[PDB]
Symmetry: D2
């Protein structure tokens, strides 16, 4: 399994240190002018300046790279840094982007407010249907951007299918795989060109850092991403890379519990009288199931369910003793949130409708607490 | 008027659990009391926090410190100076807009303005901003922004910020000034007419060579809100631990800058009179073109400057035989740094731009630290006197 | 009743500024509202903080977490396991007192008991604590404390904590137990009758090999107050950053221990049936001397144990041709560690005490991590075939 | 002779992976090349590391900086000043030995010496060490150590270190000096004859009020080894992150101490001439007993000192109405702190020792920071002139 690989990453120890040191430094010394000049031309081994490359950050990069099966990986200050760099490194004025109609709030914001200002045409469309992608296609389409399962509805897209369309028609396929982690979803393995995550979520898993990572199938593309990063300036700080690498050491073990717990909570909720419906990709009733079952080796533990009214949703969210009312996901403890008024509050009403987000929906992120304790907490907030 | 040393040591805000040092909020998310209290914070209603990308208390304390020396309506911290530059430009500029920028800029700003902006349909001209008439001559009906570095990295070329600000204000353009080389102790672009002042905190502000970060300050509440809206989507964030270090570094900014200024001038004068040195580009020297603008618009000088040797081989012999100065890029550190712009910080700048910047293989850039100045001068002197 | 996994993920206490992760109070000192309020806090009156050596909120959060698994009146965090050991013993023992300690202990514990305590006028007898009668026989009118590790470092020798605690209760002596090797998931000494339970946090509790720290937990409020009073003067503090990392590490302690246990047992059994191996000392093996006491007193096992090679040359050959296991001291990390006690962790212990501990150039100690066991066995197997 | 400022900015030792800032070795253990190479390291042969309790690279960098200003054979870092004091005393003293210590000491040092040492069969007398004759009169055949704090916390009482060192040297006792209040910039006890100089690093050395730590330096390789042998068993360690912060703090130590010294003297003179102030105990004042000794044995003054108000009520009124000084214990921070010894730092000192120490409810201790001195003085003045 992946645990051994993550505990035994490639490369040398620094001064025989067992834990890899924190290179809390901005700059690096040169042995000579020639050696420094050589490093700026990409010749020889070594470092220059932490924005171009930091050993502690590179160590975390290598960890993600190996699990993704990439040619390379780039860490950023946030998921949004990885997202904006994995798109604006490639898209320019006159290009067209097709994006999933259902996305994290700030991704909607990026694609909807910023890209069109830079002359980039953007269409949000229902990517759970490959033919809708073929129809939205234009002669200037350079990229398709997917989340799958999507935030917050878990809507599934056919990554393999869309990848074939992209390869045939000369477009990059970019997949935000935050919700599932690289334990269970490896988009590069499905034909995607770029796979990215908010490391703030499962990969770090401890709710104490914000970070992003992007991984590219080709050496050229990862180099472009790092060239953009050098100029856009969204970096992972060395301390944060130390914590992300450290949190990643328990990643495969944490996901196993996340997946089993998310599944059990979802079923509990699904057969409860108070719950209209549960959107979990691992349920036989959920419309994305057959594709998700086939394209993923497991499931994350964040999903959405429907209450009968706003009052009922508020009442449930406000009477949990173990679950915490908070945005974010993928933390070791259970989080709960209300998309309409929180993570997706700023989404234009028209895109809101297309996503199917209403005041009755509540989103949960199941931690690794004992399941029966979290089922019990939900139970008393539902019935009592 | 309370001195700046005092202001930086006593920033406004409540203590947290009576802690003397401001804690490190190494957290991603924040808890809500109720769905209403959370919904409201997302609406901008009420006091509190949601998520560190949107606002982190440790970072916010550092932003308050900066906002207070700058005299701004607000400040935003970033993962790097480049994060601050991207967000202070691309937050306002859009396809069809025109930017006038100084022709002498930090190499990666050159790359940003030259490779990325045009790909986004932004028109860019690099102009000699030391001449206001040339800025006027480059102006177009669609000009939206002027971006300046003064003194410029690495040649110390001085631009008339005041004079340029008048033209921006008459014609509806934002004036954005990168004041990294001088620090906000000595250069306050918002007091000179700029709309935005920004810094690589990586340099003087932090001062200890152990953090990369950026900060941008705006004259107007609206502009700082727009910048932070961009930051939220573009994602260049200062990490809580890095904010804690920069705020800590900043506690000694005024006294460090006083020593930097005085050391830098003494080193420049020593070099200026040395047989081996052809020319010294320090804006505090009377021989420097633009000394008169610099002395009127600033209140001191940073300690990073450029000088000319007789040859490239002479520059290398100097650079490689120092025992106190360290050969490395960056600047504004407590210890003295030295580098060769032509093959290092500015090695990727396109040939025509490098020629217009005046960067040759004979040039050496020094960033003088806070060591005893006699030790620094004796180190340079022994290297210049080598067999 | 809430499960321990849930308990560790939901520590008691107020959030600071609504922060989800508990903040790192990297501060030395704290402000007072008024002279009266400062003065009151110095007298233990009212709620609040003064100075991090007396108490730091980040450190106290970690302390609360540990106090909960142990079932203690209170816990104290220190700069190291040795700080915990020194403070848990010398806070109580004074000139003329007598201490009985297990004869097989961590090397620096031996150094502490054998070099420093007798200089402070404290009499120390190291005796075989796996036999309760040898404890009774070694007793004196001035015996104030019994100190144990079980299973012991590095031989895993098991003592009957519960039987020894009865003797201590009867005779007016504190029982102090170093439970580092087992973690508080599996061994809770305060539940067996011990007065104090301590750990090198550097090991399983943190579990990520990147911090050094100690913790001590006491059955009574008066004893933990005494320990903290010693700590105020001796000055072995846990740093706020390290407390943040230990609390964070501890968030996964129960799942990590479960894997450590099952992994360790599988590796012990593989070695027990390999022809190159004379014996395996794992308290969870049916063939191990104190197995019955250990099954009864503990609810699982740590994954650090000792095995015997045929010669020094074979032991060396094994340790130096492993590709996954790392040659290094320490234990309880996420990754597998391996060490040669005779020349490393216990190199400094006097011949005298080494004879009685049964440590020889042929013993190798492994600390099995949470890697896939099949990878650890494959590494071991490959080295044993050269 | 290279200045101390330069020396601290340019410490000996190789760079790690060419990193300009020294990395933080947040690790517990270290890998061995072979069983022989590890065996060797346990015997003390070869270069390298084993385990962070025995030695950590980031902590050793901080130790070398301290060793370099002290002039020592080696230094050892601890989790606190109290860890440095414990390990500097109990590593040497054993049952039957006798210690002479100053009668005016930091509260917890009093607790250590009067509560813990006697329990270990060590005999202790607290003596007025400002009188060398009183030290000689308290000497016994078994005296093994004299421990001094000078100027003492909180009364600034001055001991003659040099004169007392002569007696220690003649009679085979170690002289241990706690030099926390003055910093190693201004007081170097190893140059005056001490065997051991120690500090709470939590104060001036780190300077930023965000770390608790201790350091002890010895004149002899054998003594520093014994101190470290004790440390490995007593377990008071400086954490790698804390060592990183202390080393970074120490980079500005000389300039910070220069401002502390000047500010502190100016505040003392202001208070000394103020109608509301009865007496000022600053060892830099001509009116202070022991000024002549302090001026001869130190090359400057710390900025923490004590003054006497007309009453407890007057003291409380002053302490509670300041806006730039912060009411809190500790000292040597960049910002100004103020404290009431009688009910705070020394509230736990036995009545007899407190009468000997001279501590009354009328005394206020101020630790003067690096704020502009006019701002600090104006803040004191407005509080002293309250309705
Ligand atoms: C508060 C944030 C939430 N999500 C964020 C997120 C990001 C953005 O990642 P940074 O937050 O920039 O690291 C990217 N991609 C996905 C699928 C996401 O869900 C949340 O929903 O609760
Ligand atoms: C290695 C870096 C050098 N400069 C950087 C720099 C930045 C960029 O700031 P970050 O490096 O992104 O924090 C922005 N603005 C100015 C005037 C700069 O000098 C250097 O010159 O040596
Ligand atoms: C290198 C250290 C090893 N052990 C340490 C240890 C300590 C001491 O704990 P600090 O090292 O002070 O945290 C206390 N108690 C026990 C049963 C221990 O094994 C080791 O054996 O490999
Ligand atoms: C709050 C602390 C104060 N003092 C401390 C101190 C220590 C003890 O050092 P740690 O505090 O253990 O680093 C040792 N030696 C001296 C002369 C001291 O002043 C104080 O006075 O206000």
């Amino acid at each position: 399994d992946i645990t051994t690989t993550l505990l035994h990453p490639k490369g040398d120890h620094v001064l025989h240190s067992h834990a890899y040191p924190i290179f809390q430094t901005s700059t690096f010394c040169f042995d000579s002018t020639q050696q420094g000049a050589d490093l700026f031309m990409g010749k020889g081994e070594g470092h220059i300046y932490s924005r171009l490359g930091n050993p502690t950050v590179e160590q975390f990069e290598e960890m993600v790279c190996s699990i993704e099966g990439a040619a390379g990986s780039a860490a950023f200050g946030s998921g949004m840094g990885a997202i904006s760099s994995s798109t604006l490194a490639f898209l320019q004025k006159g290009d067209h982007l097709i994006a999933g109609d259902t996305l994290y709030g700030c991704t909607v914001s990026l694609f909807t407010h910023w890209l069109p200002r830079f002359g980039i045409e953007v269409d949000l469309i229902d990517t759970s249907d490959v033919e809708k992608v073929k129809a939205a296609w234009k002669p200037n389409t350079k990229m398709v951007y997917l989340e799958s399962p999507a935030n917050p509805t878990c809507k599934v897209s056919d990554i393999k299918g869309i990848a074939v369309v992209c390869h045939e028609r000369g477009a990059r396929l970019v997949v935000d795989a935050t919700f599932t982690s690289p334990c269970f979803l490896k988009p590069l393995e499905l034909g995607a060109d770029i796979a990215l995550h908010s490391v703030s979520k499962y990969i770090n898993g401890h709710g104490d850092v914000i970070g992003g990572v992007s991984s590219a199938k080709t050496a050229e593309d990862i180099a472009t991403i790092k060239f953009y990063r050098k100029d856009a300036g969204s970096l992972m700080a060395p301390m944060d890379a130390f914590l992300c690498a450290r949190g990643m050491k328990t990643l495969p073990i944490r996901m196993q519990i996340h997946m089993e717990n998310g599944l059990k909570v979802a079923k509990f909720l699904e057969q409860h009288e108070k719950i209209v419906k549960v959107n979990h990709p691992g349920l036989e009733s959920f419309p994305g199931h057959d594709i998700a079952k086939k394209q993923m080796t497991g499931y994350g533990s964040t999903f959405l369910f429907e209450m009968k009214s706003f009052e009922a949703a508020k009442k449930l969210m406000e009477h949990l003793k173990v679950c915490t009312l908070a945005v974010s996901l993928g933390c070791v403890d259970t989080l709960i949130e209300h998309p309409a008024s929180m993570t997706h509050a700023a989404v234009p009403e028209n895109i809101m409708r297309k996503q199917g987000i209403t005041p009755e929906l509540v989103r949960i992120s199941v931690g690794i607490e004992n399941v029966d304790d979290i089922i019990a907490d939900l139970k008393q907030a539902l019935e009592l």
